Structures are given as C-alpha cells and as structure tokens.
Amino acid sequence: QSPALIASQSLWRCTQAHDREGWLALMADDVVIETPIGKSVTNPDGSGIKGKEAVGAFFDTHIAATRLTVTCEETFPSSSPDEIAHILVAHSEFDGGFTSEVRGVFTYRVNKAGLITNLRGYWNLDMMTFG
Numbered sequence: 001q002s003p004a005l006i007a008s009q010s011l012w013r014c015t016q017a018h019d020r021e022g023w024l025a026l027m028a029d030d031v032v033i034e035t036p037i038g039k040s041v042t043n044p045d046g047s048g049i050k051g052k053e054a055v056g057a058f059f060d061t062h063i064a065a066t067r068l069t070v071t072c073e074e075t076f077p078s079s080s081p082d083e084i085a086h087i088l089v090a091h092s093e094f095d096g097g098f099t100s101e102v103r104g105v106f107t108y109r110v111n112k113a114g115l116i117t118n119l120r121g122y123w124n125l126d127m128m129t130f131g
C-alpha cells in the first residue's frame, strides 16, 4: 500500500465515521481541497479550501451533519507512490430525508511525510442527482 492509497482510504473511513480529528490528522498544514475543481457550494471562490483551519470548517459544514457513503468504484495508481486517482461515488443524506449523489474522478497527492496536500474532484451539477 502506497502512502497515497493509505491516505485516501483512511480519509474515506474518517469521513463516513465523522471522525473530525482523525480526518484532520491526515491533512498537511498547507492542504488544498478542490471538491469540485471550480466554483461550487463546496468550493466558493473556485480556487479551493486552503489550510487546516479552513478545511476544518469545511468538515463541520459539509461532513459533520451529513450521513455520507463513499463507494470506491475503481482505483488508478500512478508511477509515483505519492499520487493516486479514484473513481468515487459520494452519496449524501441530510437531516430530513433529502439526498444527493455524485460520481467523479478524485485525485490525491501526499507529501513525503505522507500527509494529504491536494484533493481534487472532477464533476459538475449535470452529473449530480437529488432525492
């Protein structure tokens, strides 16, 4: 298991389990999350959520109060142990019964310490469905 794979798998587990401190412990201090890449509700300025403090707020907003299910459809290693890509399906269920689901490419990068520096998602609203 490469550092990138272990990091991505650990982040899935901590995400579904709402494990805030475990989730943040996987992040580098200069982490940048772009889920999705470009402007969106989860990426306001379209340039990503930057720094552990900001992704902490991101967690509290979009993960903490949501039942999340992350399915790994397919994994694409690179020739670098520090970078990996996944086809993921992210299903959200909020307090009330409202749901959203999306499927896209997610790329991960870790530093030499094995901490996530980049998480980037390839999808848009057209690929989303709601229930």
Ligand SMILES: CC(=O)[C@@]1(O)CC[C@H]2[C@@H]3CCC4=CC(=O)CC[C@]4(C)[C@H]3CC[C@@]21C
Residues within 6 Å of the ligand: 008, 011, 012, 015, 035, 036, 042, 062, 063, 066, 068, 070, 088, 090, 091, 092, 102, 106, 119, 121
């Ligand atoms: C509530 C929402 O809008 C979403 O459910 C739609 C897509 C979701 C991504 C999917 C990718 C992912 C994989 C991880 O390993 C960490 C958690 C994230 C970033 C996760 C956060 C919540 C998001 C943004």
Ligand code: NA
Residues within 6 Å of the ligand: 110, 111, 112, 113
């Ligand atoms: Na590094």
Ligand code: NA
Residues within 6 Å of the ligand: none
């Ligand atoms: Na550095």
